[PDB]
Symmetry: C3
Subunit: 123 residues, 3 copies
């Protein structure tokens, strides 16, 4: 069987490894495992750091980076939403002016006494 | 050296601390450390909660909040993408009408017997 | 009291559980607890997997999924930002053409000798 002493040491080493998973590690930090039922330390190299799923940052630090990313990205998305509204307002305005002008173009597309005397004269 | 008993107790306390990191803690939860090689508990105060990198939420809960944020933010981004397409369609439509009207404005910008008788008469 | 042996075993089991929280588990993985101060294993069923807050993925894997989501979503948001700029440029262009045409429509909306002789004749 494993003695109480071996169990205890394996638990302590396990705890250390989870603590590095949570809090991160860097070049030169001790990395521990169990060998001959004894804890054995060696220094983390840059290869160990690169082999870690998150480059040794630890879960807490990656989560903090995600908080910053989320807040920043939400800010850009908010700026884009407002730009969309402003653009839609302008476009509707332009849509009214193009129709008013169309109607104007349509509209502007408009294109005895004698016997007595004789007897006397005879004398 | 540290006895088996001290190793075991330090491992148990280490486990408890990682478990609080993962699952969170709140005011009044016991916080444990090792003193004189013995585990020692004290109550978490609001100062301890505030001093934690994630306010005592724990890694699981912060990750759940990130799941909700991601799903919500992706929904807004999806709404913005569709608004963009609808806006582009309308704008292209307007772009066709402004050119048709321009051409119309261009186009509408258009702006013996006698001797015998005598001898007789003599008589 | 709890013996050193019980403390050690409880620490080892605690470590295993945190390690599954961090790294994930799947159907058929051993799940351990403490019973009669002894560690006791049983196989994870699909019910256990479903009962886990993240379906047994583990914190590292959920964080990796969040990295992929963040990078992808940031890419869409970047595409939307550029589409917005291109749309705004086009709209401003159209806004200039609608005003030029308006002014054109306005402008095109334009709509003794005798006594001597007698004495002689008498002879």
């Amino acid at each position: 069987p494993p003695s109480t002493d071996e169990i205890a040491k394996a638990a302590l080493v396990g705890v250390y490894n989870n603590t590095q998973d949570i809090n991160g590690f860097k070049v030169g930090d001790t990395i521990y495992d169990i060998e001959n039922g004894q804890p054995k330390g060696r220094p983390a190299t840059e290869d160990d750091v690169k082999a870690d799923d998150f480059g040794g940052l630890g879960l807490k630090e990656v989560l903090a980076q995600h908080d910053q990313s989320l807040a920043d990205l939400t800010g850009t998305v908010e700026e884009n939403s407002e730009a969309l509204v402003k653009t839609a307002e302008v476009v509707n305005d332009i849509s009214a002016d193009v129709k008013a002008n169309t109607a104007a173009i349509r509209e502007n597309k408009a294109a005895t006494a004698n016997g007595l005397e004789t007897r006397l004269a005879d004398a």
